[PDB]
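Supplementary Methods. Inverse-folding protocol.

Structures were first reduced to a discrete structure-token string of length 316. This string, shown here, constituted the complete conditioning input.
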């Protein structure tokens, strides 16, 4: 809507206070005009109809429990936009400042969040398995990254290409978590997963096997469930990414870590310049090696580490 840009205050899912950009026109709306064509957050009111109604508030204060998921979805979409703009010089997910829209309170007891090709959608969780999913910055960044992938490589959500699609979202979801310096780690969804159990997460990039996910190509899932194991086989790529950044010895293969910043630069270039809709693991390796070569030279330590990491997870 058309109005005056202002700043409100609220509390997120985890009870932390934060300032959020809003727009005033009779009501205060969750519309951030400071980033690209804007960030808009909607209330799905427990229904499955999208996007719902643009979030309206009477006093620009968002401290009600019902407001929490909206506060975080709005705020973290902003942080993710900042990450892509400041670190990769990319304006929004399409590279042309496309408006970012999110709907919260989707359905009832919905234990998931997703990018549907047009916008982000967040369930509130059932309170046991998950609490409102927008409370996890890595989750928000994971989903928005699917938008970036859709507009670039266009990886099909099936089999190996789908696993790469998922891994890319986990990788950048984690890099954004580090960017915001919000208790960063290499785990996925730890802030909103199982509130009654501490120390766990949905997936682990440092050790995928901790939750039963493969950490080597020889252990890849070849079934048909989960669209060919897109959330399962992603562990193979996630482990490779973790090794490239942090280093370590995996299955007898040693990798010298090159850091998170270079990891991000290498994968962003691979994603935007070399990957295609049907790229498989072997092609991702080639794309990553070529990207590191473009950026640091064929005889660089960076290229060596990328090769070692993929060798460690068995991807030739
Ligand atoms: Ca209010
Ligand atoms: Ca964390
Ligand atoms: Ca995390
Ligand atoms: Ca937990
Ligand atoms: Zn995903």
């Amino acid at each position: 809507i058309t109005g005056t840009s202002t700043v409100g205050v609220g509390r997120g899912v985890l009870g932390d206070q934060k300032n959020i950009n809003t727009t005033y026109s009779t009501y205060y709306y969750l519309q951030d005009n400071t980033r690209g064509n804007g960030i808009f957050t909607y209330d799905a009111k427990y229904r499955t109809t999208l996007p719902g109604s643009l979030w309206a508030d009477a006093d620009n204060q968002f401290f009600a429990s019902y407001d929490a998921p909206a506060v975080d979805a709005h705020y973290y979409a902003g942080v993710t936009y900042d990450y892509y703009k400041n670190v990769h010089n990319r304006l929004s997910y399409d590279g042309n400042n496309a408006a970012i829209r999110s709907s919260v309170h989707y359905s009832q007891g919905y234990n998931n969040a997703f990018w549907n090709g047009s916008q982000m959608v967040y369930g509130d969780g059932d309170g046991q398995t998950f609490i409102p999913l927008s409370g996890g910055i890595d989750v928000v960044a994971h989903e928005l990254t699917h938008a970036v992938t859709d507009y670039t490589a266009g990886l099909i959500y099936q089999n190996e290409s789908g696993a790469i699609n998922e891994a890319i979202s986990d990788i950048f979801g984690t890099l954004v978590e580090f960017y915001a310096n919000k208790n960063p780690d290499w785990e996925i969804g730890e802030d909103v997963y199982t509130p009654g159990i501490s120390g766990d997460s949905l997936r682990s990039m440092s050790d995928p096997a901790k939750y039963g996910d493969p950490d080597h190509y020889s252990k890849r899932y070849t079934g048909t469930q989960d669209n060919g194991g897109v959330h399962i086989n992603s562990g193979i790529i996630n482990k490779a990414a973790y090794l490239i950044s942090q280093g370590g010895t995996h299955y007898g293969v040693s990798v010298v870590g090159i850091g998170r910043d270079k990891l991000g630069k290498i994968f962003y270039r691979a994603l935007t310049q070399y990957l295609t809709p049907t790229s498989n693991f072997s092609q991702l390796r080639a794309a990553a090696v070529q990207s590191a070569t473009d950026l640091y030279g064929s005889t660089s330590q960076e290229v060596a580490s990328v090769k070692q990491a993929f060798d460690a997870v068995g991807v030739k």
